[PDB]
Design an enzyme around this catalytic site. Structure first.
Site: not given
Ligand code: ATP
Ligand code: GDP
Length: 1795
Positions: A648, A642, A1175, A1287, A1565-1566, A1265
């Site tokens: 460095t 810091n 459901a 769904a 003719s017809t 999907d």
């Molecule tokens: N709103 C709904 N109404 C009627 N049937 C539903 C409804 N939502 C889901 N289902 C039926 O319920 C079953 C469970 O669906 P779900 O979303 O759990 O499947 P999934 O995501 O493959 O399960 P998992 O997350 O465990 O893999 C499905 O076969 C679906 O057809």
């Molecule tokens: N006298 C002394 N100076 C140091 C020592 N270590 C680091 N310094 C000073 O730290 C400076 C390096 O900068 P630094 O603080 O690492 O920059 P920062 O990375 O921005 O924090 C150099 O200019 C050194 O003079 C030490 O052991 N003795």
């Protein structure tokens, strides 16, 4: 009594001298002498020369409704007023005009010759009905009064019947007033929404009506096209036979025509409307009664009117009712019921007489409360029962007598019951699917299955089972999950056909190796949750080479043996949750087919799950480690301090940089990335090279460091001991951020000062800094940091030993194995770092993909995204895979450069003018780089500079701060992490669309935002320091109103989505010691609303556990606070208010499974919410509340009629309520109910799914999907409003937790290859396949289950077969083309979602049955069908491409075009004559020479050329003239002058038959050119045939009885349209006639012989061909003339234009229905037919010509026979209503978002 004389005088002088308070007095004299002396009431006459005039007219005519011809003087006045003040009509209808104009036009005016009058009244009415609104009240005020004639007129003039109140409308009203059945029938057959007709039931159900109900059911539930009654969803309290009566078809029903009265007035008014506008068997089977809560069905068990249609039922559904005691008499009436299901009823005993049914199968009684024993009567024999479902009843024993009763049973299902005892031998001869799940079975008798030699799918889950009885050798699928097993019994090991085995959740110890299974067909082996130690595969492993699923999760596995590469077909391996694996073998790379591989909760020898490692690359990675793998010695050594330390200047001595030539160096800018190798000159030749990152210490760069503090690193830390015991304190923040970013990394404190003095600082580091929330400090030294010394040398040694022992999760990172393909990629990037523009060392992927080409790198496009990432974690090059930051093409080589540029902006100050506040800055600065510069800074979020920004905070004075209007939530944490605020105030900043795009004027200092919309909605994310507290808090105050509960629940999300994404070790439960959790998100509450003197803290973790109730309260429990007020995010109160759970109404039983019916063994249950069926979706322990709240925010604003919509969501438990898809998902339908899809439900499903994708892709969200399992049907009624619904929960879980590759079978080529990001064109290829499974009715999936590796790869390239040639299905040739578009390889060549719907909305694709391409260059101009054989049909054609005639037979199912020369002159027409004897049907041929030849249907050799005529035969026919009390028929050869020779049907065989009555009609003719026959058979099939231009007719007499002539037409605009030859004439209530090259049809009449109608074609074509056809402006010599007529029975008229069009004219009410163009070029022949019991098709033989060689004065003609469904004119207008109702719902659904 003098006013009569006064008006009589005025009437005289008002005329002659042009007279000019006249109208005033003549008005009051009416009111002075009203209702009497009609003579003075004739004054109305003078009015023809202050709305009081209105009220005095309608009151005068009404009171004199039928007085005399004063109405004629009244209406004349009303007509005179209207034509000058058109506004006056708004006043008439406002009064009682309806009361008087409805009476006149209906006071028996028909049948009365007052034509002069009616024409006046209709002219007057023609103007009252001009305004669109007036018709809507002219109509509504004609329904209150029962008036069927007029309510039909106002419908043919528009005046929609779904406009009154929407919630309430006409049909709801008309059903209350006890109207007439003829009145309801007109609203339904016209425009009438479904949601209003359904409400009309409950209104009309309360009252008992037999004709107003049966007319609503007929429109709500009757699929006549599929013979069904879909009365499911309706909550009809009771069913009665008087309602279903008129639904069943009747053959005797035939009616007159009486509505023509209202049809005449409809056109008369329309005529005066324009003239004033221009100038100035087949017994239905399916009967569904599902949801109707019927407590009894006895009303059907009588001998009622339907007891003769129920005997052909063949399917009956009564599930989900509340029935009991299925009536004995009924189950003997419906003697053809083959599919009965009645489950969820409240039964209590098996009727046991159901099996006495004649032909029953698939009996399903499977949720009732059937008692202990279900003994079947041993004296009934039902050898037809195939599937006997009895699940989820209360059986305590297997049914008693299955063997003696149901012999041919197949699927005995008995799950869910309470079967207990050791079962009985169960001697069933033909079982195929047993089922005994969820019972309490202890053990089966050792001879249980010893008598069912056909079992295939025995399944006994969730029992208490330990041993298996002899299993038959025919088992294929066998599931025994959730049992209590100890070892896989020897009876399962010896099943020589086993093909799947689910033995999850048992406590088995030893899984036998593949040398013990005796069956080579293993496909799946599920073994999760067992206790399996070893996976012995060494003895013999190729026996399992077919295994496609090996689930070993939650086991005590130790290693995965290397022989697992022998299971080449392994498609889904699952070894997650083992916690003791530690390694995947490099042999696993040979599992080329794996598509999922869970890695949850186990630690491997590599770091996966960055954004990739999607179970497919892990196989490639493990495969590259098989070619050659080498150790990877490279680590990161972060230096940390810091503003003044040995960072460095200590590094320069650690690396032993001998020069350090700079006599005086400066502070660091950026982070100065460098690397030094460590060649440890020892026995171990490991030359590790770790790259140092000496971070800058100055507090202005801190905003960017958290990007470069990774977790694979060894952090240093430097005291500057010179400021002893005061700097160690100033170094806690660094140690804390090391803990926040990288918890599992070491830390080496390095006291840098010894030269200058105080070394007791080792006390505090051991006291306070060692083990208190800070990371694992592993050492601490006190080096000198300016010269090499013994004190420093021992530090260099600790860096080594701590690096070579990194060991995160027991891994020893510095010495892991990686594919040599990476190390070589490392060497080329380093070797390229020397060959890049120093001004911009960035590399684009294009340049990168060439570097591998220069070398011989074996990496592909699927390897680099992982390879170039593993080089990122090692600090060789920087690269960011974020999609939002659009720079992923930029590959930052030489990290020390980018890390330096990002810090040049944070130091550039200006000592000029502070014209701006501190922190804000504009673009003040080479070749386009400056543009690239903050195209990266803004990408890096540093642009406004959120750092160095007005530290001093401004004094805000909030409007309402009275301790009860504000919500507060602290975030006490020990130190603000490094890049917290600049990240936070840049996550809430970019969210302007709060309260959703109204931006609030905000004032953000360094550590706050305070963006406020109004004193009623604001949000102040501040940061204050409390008193006597060294922590750092994050106070967020928000107004407690509704608009404020959102902001809190929306900021707490962003501030948490940031905390776990960036600093994941803050919110990390440190179980060691106690659960301090390092971040205690308090909440503040106070019982006193105001003046509480303090707001009491309350931890959120403890308060969240107080969800058992809804109120919080102190130890003094009198008063209490609702949790909604103090933390409205834990309670789902921030989301839209309509989705609060409101537990008082939700009736839901989680525990039982018989209500979990959705899907199979799933998680979503069934319940009731607000009295309706829904459901609910119970969530397991996985989904934390922070994610559930994250998903609902996107689900809450979809709102589409084709997307499953939410209804509620709450806690207790974490559930989610949605709509109940009544008929279940689609995949279950086409798996067992493939007969329900009926070519018009296959379309509405595809239209509703393409409507969902039309909206998702509009809201910029891809489904990713789409499978036949994600489509949830709602009803099986085709003409419904909501059928399919995709769904929508799947995308919510993805858009939050981001199956991302999609299911294998239903997958695009761009998504499976994984090398390219997706697009909206991926959901289209996935939808294109959905159209392939709907078309073929799930034929690809059924076969895809036994060939899954070929289920995906066959389609993954567009090489899947023809839907018809492979799977038997009807062609549907306008969707086999839509598939071949959505199934294209190139992503942007597939139709976008908006197009795939706009070409599904067409009503012509859903009717065109099959297009049959004729052979190349065949010219046919004549056809004929075969209707006496309905098994199958063929179309006998002709030929024109030869001057010598030839017939061309043509099948319809094989499409085998056959050639057979039969004459020596071109053929002109044919006809098909059948004889009821001898079982034959000859064909006749008319040719230009006159050779009338006849050949047999079968024998193509028995021919006799009949008596040759004189001219060219042009028209033949086969009639229905059986006038000898028996069957007899004739044939009418139409010669080219009129020598019509009549014949006999049986005499055709003889060579040279007798022409009975040659009636020479016209002259040479017809020429004759047509012939026809009447529409009805009542008038004895009067024939009407044309000849030349003279139309005639005859009857059994065979003499001219009419000689109408058309050339003498007095409506001349053009002459030769009538002075030309006739072509065709159709016979109906009028006559329609076609002339050569005539673009007009002539509506003559039978009796009057007058031109009752003239319908020009281009009056319709030129109205659509305006904008979509622009070039036609030069085409004023238009083409397209009437070529043929065909009239449907009573619906429409098919007109085939000489162009490519075909006209659909509704001859009844409205003219133009649709014009079906762009499918041919010349519709030359058109006629109807009937095909294979799918009767009533409309053959259309068009043409097609391509000007390939048009310059050679030749054209290539391709005749294209098509087959239109004759129901086309209905479908095209039934569909155009179907879309209107869904557009009206798509908008109203968008309003639930704003309301
Ligand atoms: N709103 C709904 N109404 C009627 N049937 C539903 C409804 N939502 C889901 N289902 C039926 O319920 C079953 C469970 O669906 P779900 O979303 O759990 O499947 P999934 O995501 O493959 O399960 P998992 O997350 O465990 O893999 C499905 O076969 C679906 O057809
Ligand atoms: N006298 C002394 N100076 C140091 C020592 N270590 C680091 N310094 C000073 O730290 C400076 C390096 O900068 P630094 O603080 O690492 O920059 P920062 O990375 O921005 O924090 C150099 O200019 C050194 O003079 C030490 O052991 N003795």
């Amino acid at each position: 009594g003098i006013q009569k004389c006064g008006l009589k005088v005025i009437s005289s002088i008002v005329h002659f001298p042009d007279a000019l308070g006249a109208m005033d007095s003549v008005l009051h004299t009416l009111q002075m002498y009203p209702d009497d002396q009609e003579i003075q009431c004739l004054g109305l006459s003078l009015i023809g020369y202050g709305h009081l005039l209105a009220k005095i007219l309608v009151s005068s005519l009404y009171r004199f409704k039928d007085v005399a011809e004063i109405q004629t003087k009244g209406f004349q006045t009303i007509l005179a007023i209207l034509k000058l003040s058109a506004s006056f009509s708004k006043l008439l209808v406002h009064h009682s005009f309806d009361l008087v104009i409805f009476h006149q036009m209906s006071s028996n005016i028909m049948e009365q010759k007052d034509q002069q009058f009616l024409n006046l009244c209709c002219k007057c009415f023609a103007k009252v009905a001009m305004d669109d609104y007036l018709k809507n009240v002219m109509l509504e005020r004609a329904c209150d009064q029962n008036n069927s004639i007029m309510v039909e007129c106002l419908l043919l003039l528009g005046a929609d019947a779904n406009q009154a109140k929407e919630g309430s409308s006409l049909i709801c009203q008309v059903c209350e007033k006890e109207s007439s059945p003829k009145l309801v029938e007109l609203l339904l057959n016209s425009g009438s929404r479904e949601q209003d007709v359904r409400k009309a039931l409950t209104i009309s159900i309360g009252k008992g009506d037999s004709q107003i109900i049966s007319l609503l059911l007929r429109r709500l539930a009757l699929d006549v096209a599929n013979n069904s009654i879909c009365l499911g969803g309706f909550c009809i309290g009771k069913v009665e036979p008087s309602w279903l009566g008129p639904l069943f078809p009747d053959k005797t029903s035939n009616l007159r025509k009486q509505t023509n009265i209202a049809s005449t007035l409809a056109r008369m008014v329309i005529r005066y409307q324009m003239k004033s506008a221009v100038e100035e068997r087949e017994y239905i089977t399916s009967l569904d009664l599902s949801a109707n809560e019927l407590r009894d069905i006895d009303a059907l068990s009588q001998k009622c009117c339907i007891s003769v249609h129920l005997e052909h039922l063949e399917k009956l559904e009564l599930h989900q009712n509340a029935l009991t005691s299925f009536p004995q008499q009924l189950c003997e009436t419906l003697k053809s019921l083959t599919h009965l299901d009645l489950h969820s009823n409240k039964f209590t005993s098996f009727p046991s007489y159901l099996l006495k049914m004649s032909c029953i199968a698939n009996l399903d009684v499977s949720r009732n409360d059937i008692g202990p024993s279900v003994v079947l009567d041993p004296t009934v024999k039902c050898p037809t029962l195939k599937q006997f479902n009895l699940s989820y009843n209360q059986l305590s024993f297997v049914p008693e007598n299955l063997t003696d009763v149901v012999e041919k049973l197949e699927q005995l299902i008995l799950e869910g019951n309470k079967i207990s005892g050791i079962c009985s031998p169960l001697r069933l001869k033909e079982l195929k699917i047993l089922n005994l799940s969820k019972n309490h079975i202890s053990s089966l008798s050792e001879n249980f299955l010893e008598a069912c030699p056909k079992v295939e799918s025995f399944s006994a889950r969730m029992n208490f089972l330990a041993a298996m009885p002899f299993l038959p050798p025919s088992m294929t699928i066998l599931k025994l999950s959730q049992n209590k097993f100890s070892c896989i019994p020897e009876a399962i090991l010896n099943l020589p056909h086993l093909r799947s085995l689910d033995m999850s959740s048992n406590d088995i110890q030893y899984l036998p190796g593949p040398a013990h299974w005796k069956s080579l067909n293993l496909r799946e082996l599920l073994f999760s949750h067992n206790q399996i130690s070893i996976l012995d595969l060494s003895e013999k492993a190729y026996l399992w080479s077919r295994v496609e699923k090996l689930h070993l999760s939650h086991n005590k596995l130790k290693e995965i043996p290397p022989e697992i590469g022998c299971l080449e077909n392994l498609t889904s391996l699952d070894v997650s949750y083992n916690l003791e694996l530690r390694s995947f073998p490099n042999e696993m790379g040979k599992l080329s087919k794996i598509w999922d591989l869970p890695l949850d909760e186990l630690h491997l020898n590599f770091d996966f799950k960055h954004i990739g490692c999607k179970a497919k690359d892990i196989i490639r990675f493990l495969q590259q480690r098989l070619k050659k793998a080498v150790p990877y010695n490279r680590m990161k050594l972060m230096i940390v301090g810091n503003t003044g330390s040995g960072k460095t200047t200590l590094l320069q001595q650690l690396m032993k940089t001998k020069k350090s030539d700079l006599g005086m160096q400066s502070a660091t800018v950026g982070i100065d990335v460098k690397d030094w190798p460590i060649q440890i000159r020892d026995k171990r030749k490991r030359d590790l090279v770790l790259n140092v990152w000496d971070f800058a210490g100055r507090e202005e760069f801190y905003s960017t460091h958290p990007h470069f503090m990774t977790q694979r690193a060894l952090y240093l830390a430097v005291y500057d001991l010179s400021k002893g015991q005061a700097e160690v304190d100033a170094m806690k923040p660094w140690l804390f951020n090391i803990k926040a970013r990288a918890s599992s990394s070491p830390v080496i404190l390095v006291g840098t000062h010894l030269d200058v003095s105080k070394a007791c600082m080792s006390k505090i580091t051991k006291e306070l800094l060692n083990k208190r929330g800070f990371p694992a400090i592993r050492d601490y030294h006190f080096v000198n940091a300016t010269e090499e010394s013994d004190a420093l040398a021992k530090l260099r040694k600790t860096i080594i030993n701590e690096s070579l022992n990194f060991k995160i999760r027991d891994q020893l990172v510095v010495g892991q194995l990686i594919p040599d393909c990476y190390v070589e990629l490392e060497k080329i990037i380093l070797s390229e770092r020397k060959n890049v523009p120093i001004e911009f060392p960035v590399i684009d992927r294009k340049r990168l993909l060439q570097l591998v080409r220069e070398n011989q790198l074996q990496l592909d496009e699927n390897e680099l995204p992982h390879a170039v990432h593993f080089l990122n974690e090692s600090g060789v090059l920087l690269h960011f895979q974020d999609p939002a930051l659009q720079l992923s093409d930029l590959y930052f080589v030489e990290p020390k450069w980018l890390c330096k540029i990002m810090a040049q902006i944070l130091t550039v100050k200006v000592e000029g003018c502070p014209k701006h506040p501190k922190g804000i800055i504009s673009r003040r600065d080479p070749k386009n780089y400056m543009t690239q510069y903050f195209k990266l800074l803004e990408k890096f979020q540093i642009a406004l500079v959120p750092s160095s920004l007005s530290d001093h905070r401004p004094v805000i004075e909030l409007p309402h701060c009275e301790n009860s209007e504000i919500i507060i939530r602290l975030y006490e944490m020990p130190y603000f992490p490094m890049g917290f605020w600049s990240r936070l105030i840049n996550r809430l900043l970019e969210i302007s669309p709060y309260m959703l795009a109204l931006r609030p004027n905000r004032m953000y200092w360094r550590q706050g935002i305070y963006l406020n919309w109004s004193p009623e909605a604001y949000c102040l994310v501040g940061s204050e320091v409390l008193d006597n507290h060294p922590e750092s808090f994050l106070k967020i105050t928000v107004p407690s109103c509704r608009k404020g509960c959102i902001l809190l629940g929306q900021v707490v999300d962003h501030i948490d989505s940031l905390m776990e994404e960036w600093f994941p070790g803050l919110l990390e439960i440190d179980i060691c010691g106690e659960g301090e959790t390092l971040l205690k998100k308090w909440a503040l509450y106070s019982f006193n609303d105001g003046e509480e003197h303090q707001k009491i803290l309350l931890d959120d973790l403890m308060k969240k556990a107080e969800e058992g109730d809804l109120l919080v309260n102190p130890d003094q429990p009198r008063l209490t606070i609702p949790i909604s007020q103090i933390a409205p995010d834990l309670i789902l109160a921030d989301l839209p208010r309509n989705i609060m759970l409101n537990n008082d109404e939700l009736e839901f039983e989680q525990a039982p499974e018989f209500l979990l019916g959705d899907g199979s063994f799933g998680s979503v249950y069934r319940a009731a919410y607000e009295g309706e069926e829904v459901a609910v979706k119970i969530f397991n322990k996985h989904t934390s509340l922070r994610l559930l709240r994250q998903e609902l925010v996107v689900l809450c604003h979809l709102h589409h009629p084709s997307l499953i919509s939410l209804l509620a969501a709450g806690i207790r438990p974490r559930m989610l309520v949605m709509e109940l898809a009544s008929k279940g998902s689609l995949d279950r339908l086409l798996q067992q109910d493939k007969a329900s899809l009926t070519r018009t439900l296959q379309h509405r499903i595809a239209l509703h799914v393409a409507d969902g994708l039309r909206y998702l892709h509009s809201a910029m969200i891809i489904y990713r999907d789409l499978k036949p399992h994600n489509v949830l049907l709602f009803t099986l009624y085709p003409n419904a409003a909501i059928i399919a619904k995709i769904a929508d929960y799947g995308i919510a879980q993805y858009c939050c937790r981001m199956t991302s590759e999609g299911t294998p079978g239903f997958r695009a080529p761009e998504v499976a290859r994984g090398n390219v990001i997706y697009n909206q064109q991926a959901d289209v290829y996935s939808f294109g396949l959905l159209l392939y499974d709907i078309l073929t009715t799930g034929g690809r999936i059924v076969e895809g289950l036994k060939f899954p590796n070929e289920f995906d790869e066959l389609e993954i390239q567009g090489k899947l077969p023809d839907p018809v040639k492979e799977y038997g299905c009807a062609p549907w040739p306008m969707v086999e083309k839509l598939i071949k578009q959505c199934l294209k390889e190139n992503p942007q060549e597939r139709p976008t979602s908006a197009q795939v719907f706009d070409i599904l909305n067409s009503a012509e694709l859903v009717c065109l049955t099959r297009r049959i391409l004729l052979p190349k260059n065949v010219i046919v101009e004549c056809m004929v069908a075969t209707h006496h054989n309905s098994r199958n049909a063929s179309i006998w054609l002709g030929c024109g491409h030869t001057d010598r005639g030839q017939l061309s037979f043509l099948d319809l199912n094989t499409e085998g075009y056959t050639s057979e020369e039969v004459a020596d002159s071109r053929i002109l027409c044919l006809a098909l004559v059948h004889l009821p004897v001898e079982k034959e049907s000859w064909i006749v041929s008319g040719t230009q020479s006159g050779t009338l030849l006849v050949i047999n249907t079968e024998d193509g050799k028995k021919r006799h050329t009949l008596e040759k005529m004189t001219d060219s035969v042009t028209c033949l026919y086969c009639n229905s003239f059986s006038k000898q009390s028996k069957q007899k028929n004739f044939l009418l050869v139409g010669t080219a002058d009129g020598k019509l020779a009549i014949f006999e049907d049986k005499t055709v065989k003889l060579k040279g038959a007798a022409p009975l009555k040659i009636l020479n009609i016209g002259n040479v003719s017809t020429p004759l050119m047509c012939l026809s026959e009447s529409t009805n058979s009542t008038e004895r099939n009067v024939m009407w045939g044309g000849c030349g231009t003279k139309i005639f007719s005859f009857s059994n007499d065979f003499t001219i009885q009419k000689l109408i002539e058309t050339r003498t037409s007095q409506l001349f605009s053009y002459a030769a349209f009538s002075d030309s030859n006739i072509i065709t004439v159709v016979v109906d209530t009028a006559l329609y006639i076609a002339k050569q090259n005539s673009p007009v049809v002539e509506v003559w009449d039978k009796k009057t012989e007058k031109l009752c109608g003239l319908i020009d074609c281009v009056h319709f074509l030129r109205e659509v061909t305006v904008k979509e056809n622009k070039e036609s402006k030069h085409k004023m010599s238009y083409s397209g003339r009437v070529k043929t007529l065909c009239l449907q029975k009573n619906t429409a008229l098919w007109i085939g234009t000489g162009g490519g069009h075909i006209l659909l004219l509704d001859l009844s009410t409205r003219r133009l229905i649709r014009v079906i163009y762009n499918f041919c070029n010349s519709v030359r022949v058109m006629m109807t037919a009937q095909l294979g019991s799918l009767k009533n098709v409309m053959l259309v033989l068009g043409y097609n010509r391509k000007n390939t060689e048009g310059t050679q004065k030749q054209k290539e003609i391709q005749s294209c026979l098509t087959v239109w469904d004759i129901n086309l004119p209905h479908e095209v207008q039934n569909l155009e209503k179907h879309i209107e109702v869904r557009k009206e719902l798509a908008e109203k659904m968008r309003r639930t978002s704003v309301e």
